[PDB]
Amino acid sequence: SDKLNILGVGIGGRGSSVLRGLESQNIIGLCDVDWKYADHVFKRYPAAKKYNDYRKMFDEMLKSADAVMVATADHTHAIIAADAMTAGKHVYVEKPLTHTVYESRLLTKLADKYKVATQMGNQGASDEGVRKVCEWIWNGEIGEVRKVETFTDRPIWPQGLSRPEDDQRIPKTLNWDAFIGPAPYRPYNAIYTPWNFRGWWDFGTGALGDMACHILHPVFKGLKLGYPTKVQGSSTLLLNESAPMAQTVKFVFPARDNMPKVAMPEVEVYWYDGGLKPARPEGLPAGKDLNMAGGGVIFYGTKDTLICGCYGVNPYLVSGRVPNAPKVLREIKESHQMDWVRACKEDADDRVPSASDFSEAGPFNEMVVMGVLAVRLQNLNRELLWDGPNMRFTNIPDDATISAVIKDGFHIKDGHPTFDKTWTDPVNAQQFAQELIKHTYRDGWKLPDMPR
Amino acid sequence: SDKLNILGVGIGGRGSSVLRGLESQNIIGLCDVDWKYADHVFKRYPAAKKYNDYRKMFDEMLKSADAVMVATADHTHAIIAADAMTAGKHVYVEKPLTHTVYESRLLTKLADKYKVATQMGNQGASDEGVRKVCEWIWNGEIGEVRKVETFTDRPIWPQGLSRPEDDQRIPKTLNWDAFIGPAPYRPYNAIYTPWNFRGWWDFGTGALGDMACHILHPVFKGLKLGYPTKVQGSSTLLLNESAPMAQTVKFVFPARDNMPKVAMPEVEVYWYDGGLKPARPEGLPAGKDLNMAGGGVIFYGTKDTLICGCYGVNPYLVSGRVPNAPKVLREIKESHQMDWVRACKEDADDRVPSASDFSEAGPFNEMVVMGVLAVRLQNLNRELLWDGPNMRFTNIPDDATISAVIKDGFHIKDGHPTFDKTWTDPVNAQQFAQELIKHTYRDGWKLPDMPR
Ligand SMILES: NC(=O)c1ccc[n+]([C@@H]2O[C@H](COP(=O)([O-])OP(=O)(O)OC[C@H]3O[C@@H](n4cnc5c(N)ncnc54)[C@H](O)[C@@H]3O)[C@@H](O)[C@H]2O)c1
Ligand SMILES: NC(=O)c1ccc[n+]([C@@H]2O[C@H](COP(=O)([O-])OP(=O)(O)OC[C@H]3O[C@@H](n4cnc5c(N)ncnc54)[C@H](O)[C@@H]3O)[C@@H](O)[C@H]2O)c1
C-alpha cells in the first residue's frame, strides 16, 4: 500500500480543507450529521460511502480503513478518536484535541498502547516559526523564561448567549441525536450547529478551543511544559451554558530539568482574549502590532524578549538581533496532513512521529482545556491547585457550592435601573469540577477504559 | 454659622440623597431638565424655585446663593461648576468631577483662584478606611509600593450599545437641549437619560466614572500621586459611541519625594473592570473575596500587602498584622456633605479644606478620566507618554489615525459565518486625542478661560 484508506468524520467545515490536504490518499467513507451543510463535500468525493452516524460507519467500514480524520464539534472528538484507535487505526483529530482533560489523558495513553500514528490538527506545529522559537530558547538566546504572555483577538463571534427559547423543527437532513453524542440532550436549534457550537460549554470550548492550540504551541514545546501546578481565571459575565466575551487565565508550571544552555525554572503563563491584551513589553517600538495572524506570544527572558504571532509566525527578538542558533528539530517538508500520512505508513518500531503526535498534543491540550476549568470555577475565589497525575484539584472545599448566571435581567423603567439576574441553584463545587474534568456520558455513549 | 443658601442642579437621582444630606441648610432653588423623573424631589422642597435650565436659574438666583450642588450627567458638571465658582460660589460636584482632563484642570485652578470651598462627591474620602490605609502606608507598615492592582465588578448594566435608529418623541417634561448641553447634539432617546448616560462616551465615562473615584481614592492619596507619566489600555470591542463591556488600564506614576518612614518610588497602577480581576496575591487565604462593596485595591509593598475594598473599606494586611500607626489625618465627624458645608463657612484664609477639595480631587479625577483616553486610543499600539503640565500626549505620530467599530455585523447563513463590521472613517489621532482631552463645546456653551 502507498494509499491509506481514510474515513472522514465531520466534513462540512474545516474537514473540507483537511480532506483536500489528504486527497492523494483513499477517501472511502465520509460521515456527517448534516447532509445539507456537508453536501458540497460529499460531491467532491463521489465514491465514498455516506453516513450520518459515525458508529454505523465504523461498524461497516473500520475493517476496510487504516485511518480516520475527525473534524466534528469538540465534545465528540474523543469518543470518535478513541473508538478508532482501540480498533488499531491512525487518527487525525482537529484542535482542540478533546473537550475535557480526562479525554485528553485517555487519547494520549491509547496512542501509546495501540502504537498508531496520531496528529492533532494544529498545523502551525509543522511550520518553520516554532522551529526557530524552540531553537532560540534552547540555545540560550533569551536566557531563562519566568513569564510568558499570550493572547488572541478571538472571540470575533457573539458569545455570552442564553439558551434560545423557541423550539425549532429538526431538518430531515440533520441527525441531531448523533450531534449531541455523549453530551446532555437538549432541543435542537440552529444556534448550536453548524459552526456556532464553539460558544456553548457542552459542545465547544470558546476562544480557548478556537485559538489557543495555535497560539500556545510554541510556549508548550519551547519551554517543555507538562502539567501545571496552579491556575486561575476571570472573565466577563460567566453564564451557565455559554462562554464569556473575554477572559484571562494565569497558569503556573513547575521547574523542569535544565538544558545545557538554558535553565527551565518555574514559569507563569498568562492568557488574554476577547480584545484584552498584555501590556506592551519594554523595548518594543511604539506602533508595532503585537497581533500577528490572530494573536501573539511574548517570552520574557532574562537576556531578551522573544515575540511571535499565532501559529508561531515571524518570531523576533525585541533587541532587533537575529540569532543563528543550531538546528535541532526535524524540518517538515509535507503539509501537516501529509506528514501524518507518512507516519501512518512507517512500521511502529521505526516510526518518526508527526509534529502533533498525541504524546505531545495530549498534555498540551490539557493545558488549553484547563483554561476552561479556571474560568468556570472563578467564583470559588482561589488559586486552583492541580494534581496532574490524578486529574483533580486538591483545594476545593467539600462544602463549597458554585452557581452561574442564567440570564442577565437588567432593565430601566422611567429612568430607574433594576439589576435582576437569574442564577442556577447552587451545586456542590467538587462534583461540578470533577464532572467538567471528566463528563458523565449520556447513556448509550461510552469511552474505552483507561489502560492497565 | 447660619445657613448656606444652596442651589441644586441635577436632583432626580444621586442629587436626591445629596440634597437630603444638605437639608439642614436652605435649599432655595432646584434645576432639573426632567420634571417627571425629578418631580418627587421638587416636592420634598416646595419652597425652592423650579427650573429646567441651569443658566436660567443662575441668572435669576446666583445672587441669592452661596453654594451649588451639581449631580448632573458627567459631561455637564464642569460648565455648571465653573459658572458657579467664577461667581464666588462654593460647589459640591458629584464624582467623576468632570468629563475631561482639561475640565478637571480648569476646576482645580478656579477653586484656588476664587478661594471657594469645593467637594467632589466621592463620599469614601470622608470615611475611616482611607485614613487607616494612608496611616499604615505613611508609617512604613508595608514598605515601599511599586505596584497596585485595582478593580471593580462594574459595569453591571449593558454597554457596547449602538446608537438607536428609531425616532422617539421628546417628552414635554424633558428639556433635551439642556441635557445635551455642551455635547454634540443628537436625537433624543430614553437610552441616554435618565441614569443610562453612563455608557455613552459623549455623556458618561463608563465603569471608570461610575466607580473609579471610589476605588482608587486611597491609592491616589496614600501614594501621593500627581500626573502619570505613561498609560495604556485594552478592552473588549471598542465602539465609537459606547464604552466597552470590560477594560484594563496600566498607569505608571513617577517617583515622588520620600516620607520619613516610606519611600515613594515609581509605581505602576493597574485597573480592571467588567468581571476581570487581578490574580490573587500571594499569601491571601483561599476563599477570601477580593471584592468588598464593589471592588478592591491591592498594594504590593516590599514588607507586606495591603488590601482594601471600594470606598477604602475594611483594610487588612495579608500577613494578618494589624498595625498601630500614628494618627495623622483629621477624623471627619460630619457627613461628606456637611463637612463641605463647614468649610464653606470658614473664611478662606482660615479654612480647613473638606476631604475632596478640588486641590486633591481635580488631579485625582484627571487620573480617572485618563483611563478613558487610554482605552479609546488603544489602536495606536503604543504605551502613551503623558505630559501632565501641558495636558498632552507626547508620542502620538502626527499622521497616525484612529477608527472605531460602529456596529458588529456577525451572522451565520446556512452554517457559514460572515464577520462584517462597520468602521468609522479614519480621523487624525492627534486631533482625536486633543478633542477628548479638551472638548470643542457646541456653539452657545462656553467654559471660563483658564486663569494665570
Ligand atoms: N486547525 C484549524 O485551523 C481549525 C480551523 C477551523 C476549525 N477547527 C476545528 O475543527 C472542528 C470543526 O469546526 P468547524 O469550523 O469545521 O465546524 P463546523 O460545524 O463548520 O463543521 C463541523 C462539521 O462536522 C459535522 N459534525 C458535527 N458533529 C458531528 C458528529 N458527531 N458526527 C459527524 N459529523 C459531525 C457537522 O455537521 C459539520 O459539518 C472544531 O474542532 C474546531 O475547533 C480547526
Ligand atoms: N457619589 C456616589 O456614590 C454616586 C452614586 C451615583 C451617581 N453618582 C454620580 O452622580 C451623577 C448623576 O448620576 P445619577 O445616577 O444621579 O444620574 P440620573 O440620571 O439618575 O440623575 C441625574 C439627574 O440630573 C438631571 N440632569 C441631567 N443633566 C442635567 C442638566 N444638564 N441640568 C439639569 N439636570 C440635569 C437628570 O434629569 C436627573 O434628574 C453622575 O456624575 C454619577 O457619576 C455618584
Domain CATH for A84: 3.40.50.720
Q: Would you say A301 and A294 are in contact if contact means Cβ atoms under 8 Å apart? A: no
**Nearest CA among A335, A285, A292 for reference residue A315:** A292
> Please, which residues bridge with residue A308 across strands?
A297
Task: Judge contact between A140 and A217, C-beta under 8 A.
Answer: no
Helix H or strand E segment including B435: helix B429-437
Residue A60 counted as domain residue: yes
- Residue A219 is which amino acid? V
Q: Which domain holds residue A337?
A: 5-124+333-363
Nearest residue on chain A to B197, alpha-carbon basis: A415
Is-contact A396 A384, C-beta < 8 A?
yes
Per-position DSSP letters for B114-128, written without gaps between them: HT--EEES-GGGGSH
Q: Is the CB of A13 under 6 A from ligand 1?
A: yes
Residue A306 included in any domain? no
- What is the Cα A232 distance to its own chain's centre? 18
Q: Establish if A270 belongs to a structural domain.
A: no
Whole-angstrom Cα distance, residue B363 to residue B393?
16
* Residue that is written with C-alpha cell 430614553 in the block: B190
CA distance B58 to B51: 10
- B18, B31, B33, B44: residue to mutate for ligand 2 pocket, most atoms within 8 A of CB: B33
Contact A12 B276 (CB under 8 A): no
How far apart CA B148 and CA B266 sit, in angstroms, is: 11
Continuous segment of H or E residues that includes residue B427: strand B427-428
Cα distance between residue A149 and residue A251, in whole Å: 10
Give the C-alpha separation, A41 to B111, whole Å: 73
Q: How far apart are CA A425 and CA B440, in angstroms?
A: 52
Pairing verdict, β A295-301 and A305-309: antiparallel
A235, A279, A288 member nearest B250 (Cβ) = A279
Closest residue by Cα to residue B82 from B130, B126, B114? B114
CA distance A142 to chain B (A): 23
In the Cβ-directed half-sphere of B174, how many Cα atoms lie within 13 Å? Answer: 18
Burial of A19 (0-12, 13-18, 19+ CB in 10 A): buried
Distance from C-alpha of B314 to C-alpha of B161, rounded to nearest angstrom: 36
CA gap B180, A301 in Å, rounded: 52
Inter-chain CB proximity B195 and A289 less than 8 Å: no
Whether B387 is in a domain gets the answer: no
SS3 A436: helix
In eight-state DSSP terms, residue A333 is: -
Provide φ and ψ at B200, rounded to 5°.
-100, 125
Instruction: Collect all residues with Cβ–Cβ distance below 8 Å to A363 and sequence separation of at least 6.
Output: A104, A108, A220, A225, A226, A227
Q: Which chain B residues in 104-133 lie under 8 Å from chain A, judged by CB atoms? A: none
Q: What angle do CA A331, A333, A338 make, to 5 degrees?
A: 125
Considering just the CA atoms, what is the radius of gyration of chain B in Å?
A: 22
Using alpha carbons only, what angle is made at residue B192 by residues B187 and B198, rounded to the nearest 5 degrees? 140
Largest CA distance in chain B: 76
Enter the C-alpha cell of residue A325: 542558533
Instruction: Report the 10 Å Cβ neighbour count for A2.
Output: 7
Beta-carbon neighbour count of residue A260 at 10 Å?
7
Residue A327 in any domain: the answer is no
User: Alpha-carbon distance A218 to A123, whole Å?
Assistant: 12
Mutate to test the pocket of ligand 1, among A16, A32, A176 (most ligand atoms within 8 A of CB): A32
Is A415–B250 a contact, with Cβ atoms under 8 angstroms apart? no
Q: Contact, A234 vs A114, CB < 8 A?
A: no
Q: What is the DSSP letter of A48?
A: S
Burial degree of B418 (CB within 10 A; 0-12, 13-18, 19+): exposed
Residue B310 has a CB neighbour count (10 Å cut-off) of: 25
Distance from CA of A401 to the nearest CA of B (A): 12
Q: Could you give the C-alpha distances from A48 to A29, A37, B212, B325, B440, in angstroms and in order?
A: 5, 17, 62, 81, 68
Contact A41, A12 (CB under 8 A): yes
B62, β-bridge pairs:
none
- In total, how many domains does chain A have? 1
**Is residue B87 a part of any domain in this protein?**
yes
Angle at B247 between CA B162 and CA B128, to 5 degrees: 120
Chain A, chain B: beta-carbon pairs less than 8 Å apart: 132
* Separation between Cα atoms, residue A254 and residue B347, nearest integer Å: 64
Residue A287 lies in a domain: no
User: What residues 31-70 of chain A have any CB closer than 8 A to a CB of chain B?
Assistant: 34, 36-37
> Is-contact B79 B423, C-beta < 8 A?
no
* B204 occurs within a structural domain: no
Strand pairing partners for B90? B67
Identify the CA nearest to A216 among candidates A353, A80, A361, A57.
A361
- Continuous H helices in A115-236: 128-138, 176-180, 206-207, 213-215, 217-222
Q: How many whole angstroms from its chain centre is CA A133?
A: 21
Residues ending a continuous segment of chain A before a break (C–N > 2.5 Å): none
Q: Which amino acid is at B304?
A: D
Work out the burial of residue B265: count CB atoms within 10 Å of its CB; fewer than 13 is exposed, 13-18 middle, 19 or more buried: middle
Q: Which helix (H) or strand (E) holds A146?
A: strand A145-152
Find all residues with CB under 8 Å of A294, minimum gap 6, and list them: A152, A153, A154, A211, A214, A215, A309, A310, A311
CA dist., res. A344 & res. A358, Å (int) = 13
Residue A73 alpha carbon to ligand 1 centre in Å: 5
CB contact under 8 A, A236 and B417: no
Pull the grid cell for residue A32.
456527517
Which residue of chain B has the CA closest to A247?
A: B276
Contacts for A435 with CB less than 8 Å, ≥ 6 apart: none
Of the ligands numbered here, which is closest to the C-alpha atom of A13?
1
Cis peptide before B194 (omega within 30 of 0): yes
Other CB atoms within 10 A of residue B186 CB: 14
Give the span between the Cα atoms of A129 and A295, in whole angstroms.
14
| DSSP class of A137 | H
Cβ burial of A392 (10 Å; 0-12, 13-18, 19+) is middle
Strand spans (E) along A286-443: 295-301, 305-309, 316-317, 384-387, 392-393, 401-402, 405-413, 416-423, 427-428
Those residues with Cβ within 8 angstroms of residue A23's Cβ, 6 or more apart along the chain or in another chain: none
The alpha carbon of B276 is separated from its chain's Cα centroid by a whole number of angstroms, namely 20
Query: What is the CA A13 to chain-centroid distance, rounded?
Result: 17
> How near does any CA of chain B get to the CA of A224, in Å?
24
Task: Compute the C-alpha angle A222/A228/A231, nearest 5°.
Answer: 120
Interface test with A, best of B147, B151, B276 (most A CBs within 10 A): B276
The helix (run of H) or strand (run of E) holding residue A69 is strand A67-70
Alpha-carbon distance values, A39 to A29, A171, A245 (Å): 14, 14, 32
- Secondary structure (3-state) at A371: helix
- What's the grid cell of residue B268? 505602576
Cell 478656579 belongs to residue: B110
A363 vs A103: CA distance, rounded Å: 11
CB neighbourhood size of A295 (10 A): 27
Residue A225: what residue type? L
Experimental determination technique: X-ray
Residues 6+ apart with CB under 8 A from A375: A233, A234, A235, A238, A243, A244, A247, A249
Identity of the residue in B37, B158, B290 whose CB atom sits nearest the CB atom of A414: B37
Identify the CA nearest to A3 among candidates A21, A27, A20: A27
Residue B178 Cβ inside 6 Å of ligand 2? The answer reads: yes
Radius of gyration, CA atoms only, chain A:
22
The DSSP bridge partners found for residue B232 are B250
**CA dist B33 → A91, A137, A251, B93 (Å):** 69, 64, 52, 17
- Ligand positioned closest to the Cα atom of B122: 2
Look at residue A364 and give its three-state secondary structure. helix
User: What are the residue ranges of helices labelled H in A217-289?
Assistant: 217-222
Instruction: Tell me, yes or no, if A236 comes closer than 8 A to chain B by beta carbon.
Output: yes
Chain B residues in contact with A277 (beta carbon < 8 A): 234, 378
Closest of B301, B304, B302, B306 to residue B290, by C-alpha: B306
Query: Whole-angstrom Cα distance, residue A149 to residue A171?
Result: 44
Contact A381 B289 (CB under 8 A): yes
